From a paper:
The assembly of tau into amyloid filaments is a hallmark of Alzheimer's disease (AD) and other tauopathies. Cryo‐EM revealed the existence of disease‐specific tau folds, which are challenging to replicate in vitro. We studied three full‐length recombinant 0N3R tau forms (the wild‐type and the C322A and C322S variants) using an RT‐QuIC assay with brain homogenate seeding.
C322A tau formed filaments resembling AD paired helical filaments (PHFs) but with a more open C‐shaped core. C322S tau yielded structurally distinct filaments with an ordered C‐terminal region. Both mutants seeded further aggregation, whereas the wild‐type showed poor reproducibility and mainly unfolded aggregates.
Residue numbers in the entry:
A (entry chain A), B (entry chain B), C (entry chain C), D (entry chain E), E (entry chain D), F (entry chain F): 307 to 378
The structure:
Amino acid sequence: QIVYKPVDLSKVTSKAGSLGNIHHKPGGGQVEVKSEKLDFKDRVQSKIGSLDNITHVPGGGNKKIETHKLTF
Amino acid sequence: QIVYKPVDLSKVTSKAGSLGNIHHKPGGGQVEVKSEKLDFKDRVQSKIGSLDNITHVPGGGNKKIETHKLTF
Amino acid sequence: QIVYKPVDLSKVTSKAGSLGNIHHKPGGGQVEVKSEKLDFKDRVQSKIGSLDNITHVPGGGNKKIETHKLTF
Amino acid sequence: QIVYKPVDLSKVTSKAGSLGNIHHKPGGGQVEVKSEKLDFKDRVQSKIGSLDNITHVPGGGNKKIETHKLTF
Amino acid sequence: QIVYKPVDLSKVTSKAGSLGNIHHKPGGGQVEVKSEKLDFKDRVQSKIGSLDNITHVPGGGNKKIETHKLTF
Amino acid sequence: QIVYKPVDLSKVTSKAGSLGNIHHKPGGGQVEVKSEKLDFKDRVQSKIGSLDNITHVPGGGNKKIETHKLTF
């Protein structure tokens, strides 16, 4: 007899891994740029005048990773 | 006799991995740009004058990854 | 007789690994840039004039990793 | 003999008291206000939540004022 | 014989009392206000939450004032 | 014989009392205010939470004032 019974009888409850509200509220801002003879070759990545706001939220939560084997 | 019975009887309840409200409210802004003789030749990525707001929310939740094997 | 029975009878409850509200509130700002003869040749990564705010939240939570094996 | 000859032979030339260009360029902005039980009774002047930009240029120009009399 | 000859043979030239360009460029901003039970009774002047920019230029120009009299 | 000849042969030239360009460029800012039971009774002048920028330029220009009299 070969018998294989992985259960995972599990509970994740009552606000266990939440985030709150997400508010992104920029207060305006000002930018001015003057550029003349500028010259770019192979694979240049350039950002000359910037006023930049990022809210990035890949997180929170109840991440579970599991693996089983049984091998002959 | 070969018998395989993985169960996964599991419970994720009551705001367990929720997000709140998502609010993005940019307060306007101002940008001015002057460019004269510029020249770009190969794979150039450029951003000269910018006022930029990004809200990115790929997260939250209860991500579960599970794998089972049985081999001869 | 070969018998495999991993259980994982677990409980994660009541704000166990939650984050509060996420507020990103930039207070405006000011940027000015003047560029004359600049020249970039190979794989150059450049950021000349910037006022930059990043809120990055990939963390928080109840991360669990587990692995089981049985081999002959 | 009574005689009265006030002349004023005067010259005001070539940008003598001029202004340049006037530019008013607000970069946006953000305001939030919550008021519950407030009460005002007599000649009250109030400004609770404000984001305000004033450009006031009451000068410039060629205003001339002159008055003449001769009395017995 | 009574005679009165005030001349004022005067010259005001070539940018003599000029102002340059006037630029007012607010870079945005952020304000938040919460008020519960406040009470004002007589001639009260109040400014609770403010982000305020004033550009006031009452000068410049060619203002001339003159007065003449002759009395018996 | 009675005579009165004030001449005023005067010259004011070539940037003699000029001002340059006037630039007012606020760099944003942030204000937060919380008020519970405050109470003001008579002629109160109040400023609780403020971020204030004033550019006041009352000079410059060619202001001339003159007065002449002759009395018996």
